[PDB]
Design a protein around this ligand. Structure first.
Ligand SMILES: CCCCCCCCCCCCCCCC(=O)O[C@H](COC(=O)CCCCCCCC[C@H](C)CCCCCCCC)COP(=O)(O)O
Ligand SMILES: CCCCCCCCCCCCCCCC(=O)O[C@H](COC(=O)CCCCCCCC[C@H](C)CCCCCCCC)COP(=O)(O)O
Ligand SMILES: C=C/C(C)=C/[C@@]1(C)SC(=O)C(CCCCN=[N+]=[N-])=C1O
Ligand SMILES: C=C/C(C)=C/[C@@]1(C)SC(=O)C(CCCCN=[N+]=[N-])=C1O
Ligand SMILES: [K+]
Ligand SMILES: [K+]
Lengths: 415, 415
């Protein structure tokens, strides 16, 4: 029989610190308390750009505390936005972990993002068109490259056991934590900072996603717009975020006196080979990512108390995910869809939701899924709604999926 | 004692097909013959953009056979360039493999790239500036996303065991092969298509890299410009490429009667935590990636016959790599630097050089490193030059490094 976390074939990996910035709060513990209290981060957008272009979408969640309020003159000129978010969160995470001195040669970083420093592409383009090739910054390459945010964090914190950036669109932040877990269990690292970062809401990203016709335009009631698993859902809402966690072997954590928040037990990654921007309706490969995380953890489907759904509030996305949860045998788990309150942050969002899954285990509580008002018969799931649901949750799976047909499931356990 | 390939703790993984397009030829077997004969793909750039912008760099290698001569007009509008390259190479590779019918649920794709569909970002930007948000293509997101090429190949070939895109700048194409090897040995796939693709030489990328002051400007003698490990080297030269290989367990290859070209034995990934765009002068972490690939292969450095150097021909880059090769105990091996003839293709280049490494082992021959005329005493390496060198090569390491401080080494063996 093959190695699992349960049979001791893989070393035990624990989560020992988490950090996130969201549309509710810069403080992840305050985001968590706000979720439990039924708070939404989704508001009318007041940006000039909305009026300038008369955008059909006029709602979204900007960060409560803008990243650039924390950035000095040189950081504004030498990093792209996702790099600035990565530096800010990396520093916060390391402080939260008690600023440990670790062996850099056993310390990895794995941070996903959906796109990278794209604003610096269009700035460089305009600069060159206006003034020629000598107007392009010598730092343009290193700001633009999508591994840029990960590399910033690796340099900031001193990681020498690998710095990796997987990109898989809306699953990138979960996929990064999966690859960090693989790097540890394969013996290449003992500690890893991992998660996802993403840019802010801006006109051109809203335009591009709007022409796919999958965004909510419930502009008169922003907080009611994101309705994952609800019968009247009508597309997703942007909500800014970035999120990192620190994971390490249990023996490394114990040696330094760190108190684990949860266990990261297993990771499954599959793909649909179905359609570029629609999930397979049958949920089969997505369900197999969940199953694979269980096999690696040493769990059975009946052990899973909780699923943190990718739950984007698109009609076809939530339906496919409900089928995937059935395929995995996890459809008696209690389900939360955090995008109901925090919206969608693309490359960051699977990291953010993995951090929420950790807090559910730590605190034995699931926040209500907002806007869940009319159960949908196609979606036969136990969606937590109305008020928090408390329980002694032992094991949970966090789901994330991405354009391209990427499926990533992470299996966490209570510590 | 940890698993290794030699001790059977990992399954045997073989390379069973390769495909590449380069500045010398669209046909990898012709490229290889051309390399052996001392041919270079690097010429004067005749593009009008060179004179338009008066670019300081007026040399490079465009593909001998442009991707778009093979593309229908629908793909020209609805795929990014790296997606079109991935479709072209993925189809060619599958035909070369005998178009096998594999279990899709055991078939993964891992393809790296330095940036993704970035020309569609500037196009969407211009369209919106000119005509408003409803002029953005409904296909823009799926063309732009940097996972787009890997996803096109996953859908084209039917890969359901995961589609991954590692981004690590100039090491992405080797990093992809490392991750595909890890995925098979961890039991998540039995067969994988892997490698790297990258865009073409164009004015803005030239401007951006040239402003970093590390490119060769030997414009009057284009084929003499790229001189890795030469005492008179004066920086790197772009040479377009894309490359993919098919790897699978030896059992899977034997069952379908595929003849292997080589063995993929081990992979090591580390990071410098030194500087964003200069390698660590000591070569210590880069050397450790080499050592890690040997630990996983079950080899010692005294086993290594051949190193395929990253060898970009920058003064500091080649010096650091020579130190790395010493740190790893690999400095008695025969060294080849293919960028001397094919130039640098960023995200594709490590995949291309992995394919060349396979060919060396298959054919018992190393091509000459072009332009290698004056040995540099700080480089005390056995650089192959003048003539191809025939030998009974059994084990080789392919090196690739990337902005960010990424180090990737792959250990290959003769079949
Ligand atoms: C939760 C939101 C998620 C959206 C994610 C989209 C990806 C974001 C990409 C990076 C955005 C960074 C923006 C930071 C700087 C900033 O904001 O600068 C504004 C001025 O606008 C700009 O420069 C806009 C620049 C546009 C850059 C190109 C965007 C291309 C978007 C694509 C066409 C569509 C999205 C593709 C996603 C692919 C991957 C995921 C499937 C304030 O200027 P000022 O006050 O400082 O003067
Ligand atoms: C081996 C070279 C490697 C360099 C690659 C660098 C990155 C590649 C990025 C993608 C490039 C794809 C270009 C394909 C389309 C094409 O060819 O269109 C031309 C017309 O020009 C354009 O639209 C070019 C517009 C440029 C797009 C933005 C590029 C941004 C470059 C960054 C500012 C600098 C490089 C960043 C690298 C980061 C990652 C690696 C560290 C023919 O047009 P036509 O004859 O069909 O009319
Ligand atoms: C293969 C396509 C997939 C998995 C599509 C999904 C379900 S994954 C996902 O995040 C969405 C929501 C729409 C796009 C959200 N993007 N943003 N932000 C989907 O429709
Ligand atoms: C951390 C920085 C590193 C590894 C830089 C290296 C050695 S990696 C690499 O390919 C180069 C050459 C310069 C850039 C070439 N890029 N392109 N094309 C370097 O200088
Ligand atoms: K989730
Ligand atoms: K190489």
């Amino acid at each position: 029989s093959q190695p699992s976390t349960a049979n001791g074939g893989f070393p035990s990996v624990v989560v020992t610190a988490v950090t996130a910035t969201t549309s509710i709060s810069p403080d992840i513990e305050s985001t968590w308390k706000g979720l439990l209290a039924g708070e939404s981060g989704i508001h009318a957008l007041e940006d000039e750009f909305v009026t300038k272009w008369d955008l059909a979408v006029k709602i979204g969640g900007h960060l409560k505390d803008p990243v650039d309020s924390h950035m000095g003159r040189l950081d504004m000129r030498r990093m792209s936005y996702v790099q600035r978010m990565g530096k800010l969160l990396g520093g916060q995470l390391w402080e939260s972990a008690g600023s440990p001195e670790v062996d850099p040669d056993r310390f990895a970083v794995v941070v996903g993002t959906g796109l990278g420093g794209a604003e610096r592409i269009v700035e460089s383009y305009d600069l060159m068109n206006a003034g020629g090739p000598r107007k392009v910054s010598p730092l343009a390459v290193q700001m633009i490259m999508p591994n840029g945010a990960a590399a910033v964090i690796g340099l900031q914190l001193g990681a020498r056991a690998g710095v990796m950036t997987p990109v898989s669109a809306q699953s990138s932040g979960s996929e990064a934590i999966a690859h960090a877990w693989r790097q540890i269990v394969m013996g290449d690292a003992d500690v890893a900072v991992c998660g996802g970062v993403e840019g802010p809401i801006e006109a051109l990203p809203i335009a591009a996603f709007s022409m796919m016709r999958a965004m909510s335009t419930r502009n008169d009631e922003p907080e009611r717009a994101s309705r994952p698993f609800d019968k009247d859902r009508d597309g997703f809402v942007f909500g800014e975020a970035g999120a990192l966690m620190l994971i390490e072997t249990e023996e490394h954590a114990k040696a330094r006196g760190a108190k684990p928040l949860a266990r990261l037990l297993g990771a499954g990654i599959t793909s649909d080979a179905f359609h570029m921007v629609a999930p397979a309706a049958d949920g089969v490969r997505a369900g197999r990512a969940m199953t694979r995380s269980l096999e690696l953890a040493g769990l059975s489907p009946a052990d899973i108390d909780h699923v943190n759904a990718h739950g984007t509030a698109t009609p076809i996305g939530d339906a496919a995910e409900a089928n995937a949860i059935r395929v995995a045998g996890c459809d008696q788990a209690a389900v939360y869809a955090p995008k109901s309150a925090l919206g969608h942050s693309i490359g960051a969002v699977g990291a953010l939701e993995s951090v929420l899954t950790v807090l559910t285990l730590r605190d034995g509580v699931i926040p209500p899924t907002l806007n869940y008002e009319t159960p949908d018969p196609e979606i036969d799931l136990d969606v937590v709604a109305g008020e928090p649901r408390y329980g002694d949750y032992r094991y949970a799976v966090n789901n994330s999926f991405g354009f391209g047909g990427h499926n990533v499931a992470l299996a966490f356990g209570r510590y």
